[PDB]
Scaffold this active site. Structure first.
Site, PDB file in Angstrom:
ATOM      1  N   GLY A 119      -8.095 -42.664  16.430  1.00 40.56           N
ATOM      2  CA  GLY A 119      -8.596 -41.343  16.078  1.00 40.56           C
ATOM      3  C   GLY A 119     -10.071 -41.405  15.688  1.00 40.56           C
ATOM      4  N   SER A 120     -10.558 -40.367  15.007  1.00 44.44           N
ATOM      5  CA  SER A 120     -11.963 -40.317  14.626  1.00 44.44           C
ATOM      6  C   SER A 120     -12.286 -41.440  13.647  1.00 44.44           C
ATOM      7  CB  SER A 120     -12.342 -38.970  14.083  1.00 44.44           C
ATOM      8  OG  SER A 120     -11.450 -38.586  13.059  1.00 44.44           O
ATOM      9  N   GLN A 121     -11.326 -41.782  12.778  1.00 43.57           N
ATOM     10  CA  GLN A 121     -11.538 -42.824  11.793  1.00 43.57           C
ATOM     11  C   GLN A 121     -11.515 -44.197  12.460  1.00 43.57           C
ATOM     12  OE1 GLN A 121      -8.950 -42.129   8.199  1.00 43.57           O
ATOM     13  NE2 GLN A 121     -11.057 -41.844   7.485  1.00 43.57           N
ATOM     14  N   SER A 131      -6.029 -43.085  23.913  1.00 46.10           N
ATOM     15  CA  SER A 131      -6.985 -43.738  23.038  1.00 46.10           C
ATOM     16  C   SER A 131      -7.215 -45.173  23.512  1.00 46.10           C
ATOM     17  CB  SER A 131      -6.557 -43.616  21.584  1.00 46.10           C
ATOM     18  OG  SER A 131      -5.215 -44.029  21.359  1.00 46.10           O
ATOM     19  N   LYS A 174       3.393 -42.241  10.485  1.00 55.71           N
ATOM     20  CA  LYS A 174       3.656 -43.265  11.501  1.00 55.71           C
ATOM     21  C   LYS A 174       3.473 -44.691  10.973  1.00 55.71           C
ATOM     22  CE  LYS A 174       2.094 -40.081  15.032  1.00 55.71           C
ATOM     23  NZ  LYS A 174       2.021 -39.918  16.505  1.00 55.71           N
ATOM     24  N   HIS A 193      -6.282 -44.514   3.426  1.00 58.50           N
ATOM     25  CA  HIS A 193      -5.527 -43.583   2.586  1.00 58.50           C
ATOM     26  C   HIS A 193      -4.409 -44.370   1.892  1.00 58.50           C
ATOM     27  CE1 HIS A 193      -3.887 -39.998   0.828  1.00 58.50           C
ATOM     28  NE2 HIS A 193      -3.352 -39.455   1.905  1.00 58.50           N
ATOM     29  N   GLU A 234     -17.934 -15.169   6.022  1.00 58.70           N
ATOM     30  CA  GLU A 234     -19.019 -15.355   5.069  1.00 58.70           C
ATOM     31  C   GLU A 234     -18.732 -16.478   4.088  1.00 58.70           C
ATOM     32  OE1 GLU A 234     -21.333 -13.390   6.828  1.00 58.70           O
ATOM     33  OE2 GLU A 234     -22.008 -12.711   4.847  1.00 58.70           O
ATOM     34  N   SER A 243     -27.447 -12.492  -4.385  1.00 62.94           N
ATOM     35  CA  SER A 243     -28.017 -11.349  -5.076  1.00 62.94           C
ATOM     36  C   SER A 243     -27.438 -11.260  -6.500  1.00 62.94           C
ATOM     37  CB  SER A 243     -27.693 -10.089  -4.300  1.00 62.94           C
ATOM     38  OG  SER A 243     -26.291  -9.754  -4.487  1.00 62.94           O
TER      39      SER A 243
END
Ligand SMILES: [Mg+2]
Ligand SMILES: [Mg+2]
Lengths: 311, 311
Positions: free
Chosen positions: B25-27, B52, B84, B107, B216, B237
Site C-alpha cells: 500500500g502507500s505505507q 502490488s 489481515k 500500528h 468550507e 471575520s
C-alpha cells in the site's frame, strides 16, 4: 437550482461603468486587481495614511478617500467588516452615490438585517465568491439591469468560470452564519476540544492528544473536500471506517444535536443573533475580547505551538 | 516528553540488516523506497500475481513471496491492514523468522490487543509516521538493541527530520482509535451531517447547505493546521469568531460530549472495541458493509458530487 457560466454573463454590463471598491483586505485586493485586469475602470476608497492605502498604490491601483471614490463611481462594492459597513454607508456612501447608482456587497448581513437601508433609487446586489464558484443575489433592482450587472461583475472578477449560483441576501447570510456557528467554527472547535481534554484527563501525553484530535483533522477533511464523506470512508483504513460508523453517533447524537442546531438557526432567523452582535459592538466588544483571551490560554495552544515548531 | 532527531539516531543499527516489508500500500511503498534510497538491503513480500507485486517490481524493488522474503530477513516490517496481520504472522512470519529477529509495525493494534503474540526471542517495535514527525515504540527488547534499531529505521525512512517521539504500543493504538471514533471521522461526519440536514429541513437549497457545512470546513481546518485554534479565530471575520465563541457550546456541549467520549474511550481501553471489530471480520463484516451502503445513499453525496463536478 440555477447555475450561470461565463457565456451567460455579458461583460458589457460592467465594462462601461466606474467601480469603487471600499476596503482593501484580501477580498478588496482580489476584487480590485481582477476588475482592472478585466479592464474595468476601478478605484479603491480608503482612509488617508492607512496601511492598506500604501499597499493599494503599491499594487498599481488608483486610490482616493472614500467620499471621493464614491462620487466618481457608478458601482460601489463594499468589502469592509460587517460591523464597520453601516457607519461608512451612512456618512460616506449615501450622500455621495449617484442617483440610480449600484451598491454591491460580498456578504448580505448588513442589508438583510437592516443595518444598511439603501435609498430606493439604488440597485443593490451581491457577488460572494467561495474552481472558485460564486453566489449572486439582487436585493433591489431600481434600474432594471441589476442582475446582468451583477453577473458581469462576477465574470470580471473571475468567479463565473466555476459557476455562479443565484440566491438571496437572506439565504446567503443565514446559511453563512449557521455554518460558522453550528459546524465550521463553533461546533468543530468544541468537538476538537472535548476530544483533546478527554485524552489528557485519561493520562495520555498532550502531544499525542493533539496529534489525534487536531493535527490529523486535515487529512480527513482534505479527503472529504476532494471526494465527499463516501470518498473519505473509502480511503481510511477499514478499522477507522468501522469505528466512525459505530461510535460517531455516540460522540455526536443525531436528534439532540439537530435540536440544538435548530435553536442556533432560530436565533439567526429571528434577528436575535444580529441584534446581539451589533449591541456587542456598541460597548467595545467585551464578550468577544474576554472569550479571545480565555481560549488563547487553553493548554491546547501551548502544546500546539510546541509541536508545530518542532515539525 | 522525549524527542529524538537525526543526530540521535545511528544508521549503523539498520544498514547492516536485511529488511522485509510485507505489503505495498502507500505505507509499504514509502517505507520500502526510502529504505533502499538510504541504502538499506530491502525486499518486499507479496503474494504472486498481485497488483502490488507488479507495482513493486516496476518501482525497481526486489520482490518475493512472503515466506521467502521473511526467511531472508533480519527485520520484518508488517504494513498490511489490521484485520489481515494475524493470519499472515501465524502462517508465514512466525515459522520463517530467524531466532532473535525483529518484528516491526507502523500500528500497534495487533500486538496491543493480543491478535499477534510474538515469540519471546523476537524484538518487537514500531515506527509510526504521521516535516512529518513519527512515533516510536518498543514492545519487546530481546536483543538489547531494539530501541536504537527502531530509531535507525525511522531515520532511514526519513521520519527523524521533523522529530521522533517515544511512546508505547498502548498509547499509540488507543489514542489513534479514539481520535478516529470521537473526533476525526466519527464525530466530524456526524456534526457535518446534522448541520447539513438542519439547513435542508429548514428550506434552504441543498447546494448552499453543502457549501456551509462541508465544502468550507477545509478553509477552517487549514488555518487550525497552520496556526492552531487561536490562529484560526484570528483569521476569520469577527462576526464568525463571535458566533463560534457564543454558539459553539450550544451545538456541542462540553460535559455531555466528554461524558460520551469517555465511554468511547472506555470501550477502547477495555478491549471491547477490539473484540467487536475482530468478530465482525470473522463473519464477513456485514455491519461495515451495511453502513457503507446506507451512508453512500445519503442525499449529501448526490449534492456533493454535482457540486464538485461543476467546480
Ligand atoms: Mg433578500
Ligand atoms: Mg506496550
Amino acid at each position: 437550482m440555477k447555475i450561470y457560466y461565463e457565456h451567460d454573463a455579458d461583460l458589457g454590463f460592467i465594462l462601461g461603468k466606474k467601480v469603487a471598491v471600499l476596503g482593501f483586505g484580501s477580498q478588496g485586493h482580489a476584487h480590485a486587481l481582477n476588475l482592472k485586469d478585466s479592464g474595468v475602470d476601478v478605484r479603491v476608497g480608503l482612509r488617508k495614511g492607512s496601511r492598506s492605502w500604501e499597499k493599494a498604490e503599491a499594487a498599481g491601483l488608483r486610490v482616493l478617500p472614500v467620499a471621493e471614490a464614491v462620487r466618481e463611481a457608478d458601482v460601489v462594492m463594499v468589502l469592509l467588516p460587517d460591523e464597520k459597513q453601516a457607519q461608512v454607508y451612512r456618512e460616506e456612501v449615501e450622500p455621495n452615490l449617484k442617483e440610480g447608482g449600484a451598491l454591491a456587497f460580498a456578504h448580505g448581513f448588513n442589508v438583510h438585517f437592516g443595518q444598511i437601508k439603501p435609498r430606493k433609487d439604488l440597485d443593490v446586489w451581491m457577488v460572494a465568491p467561495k474552481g472558485v464558484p460564486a453566489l449572486v443575489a439582487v436585493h433591489q433592482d431600481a434600474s432594471g439591469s441589476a442582475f446582468p450587472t451583477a453577473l458581469a461583475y462576477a465574470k470580471a472578477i473571475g468567479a463565473a468560470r466555476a459557476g455562479v449560483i443565484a440566491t438571496t441576501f437572506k439565504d446567503e447570510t443565514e446559511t453563512d452564519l449557521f455554518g460558522e456557528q453550528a459546524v465550521l467554527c463553533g461546533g468543530l472547535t468544541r468537538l476538537i476540544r472535548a476530544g483533546f481534554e478527554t485524552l489528557v484527563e485519561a493520562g495520555y501525553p498532550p502531544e499525542m492528544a493533539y496529534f489525534e484530535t487536531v493535527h490529523e483533522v486535515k487529512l480527513i477533511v482534505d479527503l472529504i473536500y476532494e471526494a465527499g464523506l463516501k470518498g473519505m470512508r473509502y480511503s481510511i483504513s477499514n478499522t477507522a471506517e468501522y469505528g466512525d460508523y459505530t461510535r460517531g453517533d455516540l460522540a455526536v447524537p443525531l436528534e439532540e444535536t439537530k435540536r440544538r442546531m435548530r435553536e442556533i438557526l432560530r436565533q439567526i432567523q429571528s434577528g436575535e443573533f444580529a441584534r446581539e452582535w451589533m449591541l456587542e459592538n456598541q460597548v467595545g466588544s467585551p464578550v468577544l475580547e474576554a472569550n479571545r483571551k480565555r481560549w488563547a490560554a487553553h493548554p491546547i495552544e501551548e502544546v500546539g505551538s510546541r509541536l508545530r515548531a518542532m515539525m
